[PDB]
Design a protein around this ligand. Structure first.
Ligand SMILES: *[C@@H]1O[C@H](CO)[C@@H](O[C@@H]2O[C@H](CO)[C@@H](O)[C@H](O)[C@H]2NC(C)=O)[C@H](O)[C@H]1NC(C)=O
Ligand SMILES: CC(C)Cn1c(CN)c(-c2ccccc2)c2cc(OCC(N)=O)ccc2c1=O
Ligand SMILES: CC(C)Cn1c(CN)c(-c2ccccc2)c2cc(OCC(N)=O)ccc2c1=O
Ligand SMILES: *[C@@H]1O[C@H](CO)[C@@H](O)[C@H](O)[C@H]1NC(C)=O
Ligand SMILES: *[C@@H]1O[C@H](CO)[C@@H](O)[C@H](O)[C@H]1NC(C)=O
Ligand SMILES: *[C@@H]1O[C@H](CO)[C@@H](O)[C@H](O)[C@H]1NC(C)=O
Ligand SMILES: *[C@@H]1O[C@H](CO)[C@@H](O)[C@H](O)[C@H]1NC(C)=O
Lengths: 727, 725, 74
């Protein structure tokens, strides 16, 4: 009867149920029922309680998160959560002995701890505090201070700086244990010459003078952080003598100039692989490094370096892929672009130079999910040549041509997007299915790939959504220059092709973006389609990912070009499909998306009536180096300055006279700096263009506060409705 | 059938001509002639051209300045504006006779202020925060101070808050009447906290700049000041020049205080007024030079006090003294026994001064003093607070005072100011309305009309082809009080129609938005083109009506002046030619604060509104201004009200209205923060509203392009809220 | 040692020791005062006081001080 409303989205009436489980052995996993944390037995299920939540309510603090020690004897308890960037944060930690049943109170983990992590086995603890690394062998024993050089905003031992957090490691951590917890490897980042982004934080109305936040953030072409790499031995620490870490230096060809550490993987108890990437990110090296008893050093034999490079563009999707070492560490698998430009699993031998690809085709392997001695498990979009589908496949190691699809047929109508979570030795797996139907969580045995059970099937959301006129998603493609390009449309209920519907274009379109997939979603578009009868569409054109390098490297050294043109074309195609009102076509987006939106509105295409740019990039010199330069190279006369000059939103200001524009940016945005929009606004003022604006005080790139999140969508809704003369 | 459109306003299509002159002597002044500058004789009328000034043979000249004697001209160029008054420039000097530049010992680049002595051609400037003196344009400078440090010690120049709020000037230098002494103030912002904001700059600036200004918000550590005099004669070259400190009096040294006036009395007499930080108490000191000491001594008997039990002292500061020639006497405008501001003749010895004027109106300022007459401006005529006229008063006999301007032009001219000739033999009358402005030159010899300098007949001519709006000034009585208002009324105003009303509000202490001044502004376009009545209303807090009215909001900003703008709208709608359903309200600064507070009131009267660079809570705005009216924000003083008078606290009530919040990001004055906190408040209660920031625009939002942009954006908003196509 | 001289501010209700009326007593060759700084004896108006201090020759003698001048007279 009644539709999917804005308040439905905003307040979250129609909940989507997860099933977040944590493997701990090969046979078992931890779930949270009614707060009470239970343990389940994948074989059968005689799954009694693990840690009743009647325990930690006289704790006197909020149990933000937890973490069991691998051997199962203790429980790290996170509290005092204070978010820093996307991944980073600090918090307080108490440990609790499960066997002795009390909480440890001596040699405690300090307030304001930046990162904690158990050893992978047993119960050693490594943690970072005030930029230095500390190690505990037992919870109740004093820490061994591994590093004495940490300094706020300058030297970061065992944690990443801003740009390595957001762009390189996608994590605050820079600590990697060896598989049996003997060695602790870590990165040190030095930011001395990394200039600072400065911006006002206004805080509560009680703060009289605005605070000036200062983050080291290398914008395109600026001095970058430098990186060093160390491994220290945690079984040979001492009270009397300072623990001495051994540096593994980067290979010759990387030291010759600016570079990054971009991956760390242990192959064995005594072998580590490091991947370094040049500042110009088309050349990368993997070093295989071995511990030497007699010296106590690590040798990274030149003869076992493995070069990965790109001629058409950059290496990796966003970074070179991670290797997956065989048990003995003498060989590994990783996804690399093949001679056709398609990303596929390649088997490498430590000593040998050339790999053997064991997958191929015009589709891409997304990730290697597990390796046993008998099977390699991976995710790809092979199925039905849908680049926006995801499925689990297993390769038979004894003959790689024997490949089975585990998830393809399980429920093909409901389920075409899949992720997977394997038990410790891979003997069991949870399949998570994200669409096109309602999410479905199910448990499986690897032995037969027998379907054991449904963990969550969201029937509650179902027997509930039937009384709501939902939109329909259509995932399909159009053909431009012999190439398939895909798009999705959220279509209003009772969609009629006789009618001219107004159209909004939801755009990301950044390199390796993919906005056309089989994922099911409840969001703003669901509202715009269900209530307002607006077709929200998205289109993956050139630059977009998981469709090979020819498509993805098409925007190489040329951001703000093909990905922009392709969005204008998708509109033209959607108009030519005959069920779109040409007079009411809008375009909006966020980040890259807001840049494209802004570039499109400033293009003089005439296709678009209005648009909304939320935290847009306006000029690539303003964005961080690791991302921007991957695509744009350096902004110098000797590299790519002219196109940096050409690809700005500001230079198209004059043509915003042809559209209606809403520019929204949060003031405490550490990622895409408010600057970027402050410069768009200014350019528009200087040529006499009128437009809507909205700042969000103290909000960051997510504009994610409850009350801010609601405000922004409400404000964007009014703008759209008005652009489209909706009542 | 053409109207005064938005673009007419924006592009200055209908220009008001001025007759801005300056008196080189008692008989002659200077006037611009497109680019040329002529020397008009006020007596006969004949003149002679002297220069061609607007880029003069390599730079473009921003301003000029004649040395009293007429021997040297000072050329100002490379003007770089700082705050409301402060700026920086390069300066060159000419031997005004030989017309040749003084090439040697050039006045340095980046000079913060320069000034001639009042007689001769002595030159005092400030540079890198220190005072320098030049007895000749070609001789090297003598350096008066050495303690100048950027953002910390200001020798001879003001800091942010003195500039804006106390002196309304950058300079803190004062030459003696005969160029022998240079008195100056030195300010210390060492423990004054910095407001910090980002400055984004040209788009080629990759990293935004943080601007840091020492700025005392309400309650913060204020600056401190010391005062000095130095003999500019006897200025040794082999030794640093000694400077004689006149210290503040004991009563002020007890606590935080300011220097709020500096007036020379004779060659050897100088008067200083100091204000307690709680500005209900001030003190004047008269200081004679001691020839036998080299020093300055001010007597305790000679001291005077300016008390205020009902509010603060002054309008914005204690009024300045005008000394008779001898220096044993002076006249000062002050609040009389029952509230009204009048001229008081003081003898230096005693305290008791007797008032030379009385009545239910204020004197607005003393303009000229001579041996036998004192000339002043006031709003007595027809009991109109918004009128200005020039009155001559008989020092010999106080009952006998003639109005000079009142009757010259009744209908055209109710708002005069005046500029007197170097001595007073002649004077200029500026008439600013209510008709088109009129500039006329008078002989004070027999108070006779000599000639019309500019009558604006050019603008008159082309305004007859334009359907201009009408202006109605008048009052309404509330609680037996006369409360004045003005209305800009669409042409052909038929009051059996129902027009929409835009309430234009400042409403801050001592404001006057209802006056007899002719204006070509955004309101002209609104009434002429959009047929909107724009109105203002001088409620409690407004000035020039006595302290009863003005002190009404003392320690109580955010109360009665807000409440009184609302009954204003009720009264206007009661007049029967307003659309109840389309009454809007807008203001800048204080007006922004009041607009917001009204929109926050829940009154139901206003449909929508625009606040531009509004104050949002008084703890954010500067100490000097805020505290005068609010006091300190401490539980032992007035914290409770500071908390109760914020716009943030009324966010929930913005659910009833349409709001447009505009603010410039580089506002040094009312900080972006203030609007950042309004928005966050509004976000957190879930109130939707319109927003616009202006990147790198200060409180003026005065850039050509942003001025244009703001007014267009605000027109669109008003039109839409009013349903005007 | 520093002697302060503080006046009651009538309207303020507070006390205020003007720095112009601070008086320094210090010793170049030892400590100040015999066992401590000598107490002052004020004139009726309190504009002035007498005080035992060491003179330029080391001998303690009655110095006559003005509330406002640094210098005294023995
Ligand atoms: C400006 O004022 C500051 C105090 O606000 C003065 O600096 C005190 O100065 C003394 C004497 O040099 C130092 O021993 C203190 O430690 C200073 N305090 C601080 C906070 O700086 C400064 O000397 C004044 N300068 C002038 C020219 O008046
Ligand atoms: C790639 C990761 C290492 C980090 N990363 C980055 C890089 N900083 C960006 C991004 C791209 C360009 C400009 C600013 C941010 C990003 C943008 C997203 O936008 C979604 C949309 N617009 O619909 C979602 C996720 C991501 C993200 O995960
Ligand atoms: C008092 C002077 C020494 C300086 N000064 C100040 C300093 N406080 C303010 C002002 C008042 C409160 C808040 C921010 C600024 C001001 C406001 C004006 O408002 C225009 C209007 N709203 O119609 C016009 C002039 C002035 C002005 O001259
Ligand atoms: C912080 O942690 C310390 C010890 O690490 C603990 O004793 C204390 O209660 C915590 N709180 C504060 C306010 O320091
Ligand atoms: C960090 O900064 C500089 C390099 O620019 C160097 O002088 C210093 O040695 C480095 N510090 C550490 C701890 O590596
Ligand atoms: C460890 O190194 C630090 C920093 O160099 C030094 O000050 C100290 O002597 C050493 N501490 C221990 C416990 O050996
Ligand atoms: C861990 O690995 C180290 C280094 O290979 C080895 O010497 C040690 O025996 C291993 N520890 C355990 C408990 O297996």
């Amino acid at each position: 009867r009644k539709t999917y409303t804005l308040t439905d989205y905003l307040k979250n009436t129609y909940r989507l149920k997860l099933y977040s489980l944590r493997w701990i052995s090969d046979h078992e996993y931890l779930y949270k029922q009614e707060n009470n944390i239970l343990v389940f037995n994948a074989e059968y299920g005689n799954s009694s309680v693990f840690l009743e939540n009647s325990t930690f309510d006289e704790f006197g603090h909020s149990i933000n998160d937890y973490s069991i020690s691998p051997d199962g004897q203790f429980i790290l308890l996170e509290y005092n959560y204070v978010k820093q960037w996307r991944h980073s944060y600090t918090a307080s930690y108490d440990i609790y002995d499960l066997n002795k049943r009390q909480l440890i109170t001596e040699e405690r983990i300090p307030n304001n701890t930046q990162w904690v992590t158990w050893s992978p086995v047993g119960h050693k603890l490594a943690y970072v505090w005030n930029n230095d690394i500390y190690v505990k062998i037992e919870p109740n024993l004093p820490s061994y201070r591994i590093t004495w050089t940490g300094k706020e905003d300058i030297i970061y031992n065992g944690i990443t700086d801003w740009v390595y957090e957001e762009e390189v490691f996608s994590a605050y951590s820079a600590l990697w244990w060896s598989p049996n917890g003997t060695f602790l490897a870590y990165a040190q980042f030095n930011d001395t010459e990394v200039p600072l982004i400065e911006y006002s934080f206004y805080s509560d109305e009680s703060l009289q003078y605005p605070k000036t936040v200062r983050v080291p953030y290398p914008k395109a072409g600026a001095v970058n952080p430098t990186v060093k790499f160390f491994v220290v031995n945690t079984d040979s620490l001492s009270s009397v003598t300072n623990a001495t870490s051994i540096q593994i230096t980067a290979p010759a060809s990387m030291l010759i100039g600016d570079h990054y550490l971009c991956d760390v993987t242990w192959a064995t108890q005594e072998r580590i692989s490091l991947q370094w990437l040049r500042r110009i990110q088309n050349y990368s090296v993997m070093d295989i490094c071995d511990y030497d008893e007699s010296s106590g050093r690590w040798n990274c034999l030149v003869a076992r370096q493995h070069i990965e490079m790109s001629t058409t563009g950059w290496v990796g999707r966003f970074r070179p892929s991670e290797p997956h070492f065989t048990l003995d560490g003498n060989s590994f698998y990783k996804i690399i672009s093949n001679e056709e430009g398609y990303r596929h699993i390649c088997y490498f031998q430590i000593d040998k130079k050339d790999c053997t690809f064991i997958t191929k085709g015009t589709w891409e392997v997304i990730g290697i999910e597990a390796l046993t001695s008998d099977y390699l498990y991976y995710i790809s979009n092979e199925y039905k040549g849908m680049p926006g589908g995801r499925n689990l496949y297993k390769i038979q190691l004894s003959d790689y041509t024997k490949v089975t699809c585990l998830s393809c047929e399980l429920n093909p109508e409901r389920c075409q997007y899949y992720s997977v979570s394997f038990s410790k030795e891979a003997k069991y797996y949870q399949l998570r299915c994200s669409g096109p139907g309602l999410p479905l969580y199910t448990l499986h045995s690897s032995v037969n790939d027998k379907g054991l059970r449904v963990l969550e099937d969201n029937s509650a959301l179902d027997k509930m959504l039937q009384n709501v006129q939902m939109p329909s998603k259509k995932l399909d493609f159009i053909i431009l220059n012999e190439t398939k390009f895909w798009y999705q449309m959220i279509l209003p209920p009772h969609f009629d092709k006789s009618k001219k519907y107004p159209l909004l274009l939801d755009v990301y379109a950044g390199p390796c973006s993919q906005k056309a997939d089989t994922v099911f979603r409840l969001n703003w578009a669901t509202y715009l389609a269900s209530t307002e009868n607006i077709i929200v569409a998205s289109f993956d054109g050139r630059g977009s990912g998981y469709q090979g390098d020819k498509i993805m490297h098409a925007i190489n050294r040329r951001l703000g070009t093909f990905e922009v043109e392709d969005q204008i074309e998708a509109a033209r195609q959607f108009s030519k499909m005959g069920f779109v009102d040409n007079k009411r076509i809008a375009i909006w987006g966020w980040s890259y998306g807001g840049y494209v939106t802004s570039m499109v509105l400033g293009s003089g295409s005439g296709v678009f009536k209005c648009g909304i740019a939320v935290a847009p990039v306006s000029r690539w010199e303003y964005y961080d180096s690791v991302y921007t330069e991957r695509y744009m190279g350096l902004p110098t006369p000797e590299d790519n300055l002219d196109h940096y000059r050409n690809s700005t939103v500001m230079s198209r200001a004059e043509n915003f006279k042809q559209v209606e524009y809403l520019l929204i940016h949060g003031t405490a945005d550490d990622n895409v700096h408010f600057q970027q929009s402050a410069q768009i606004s200014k350019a528009l003022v200087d040529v006499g263009v009128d437009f809507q604006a909205m700042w969000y005080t103290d909000e960051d790139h997510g504009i994610a506060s409850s009350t801010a999140h609601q405000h922004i969508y409400t404000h964007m809704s009014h703008f759209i409705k008005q652009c489209f003369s909706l009542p």
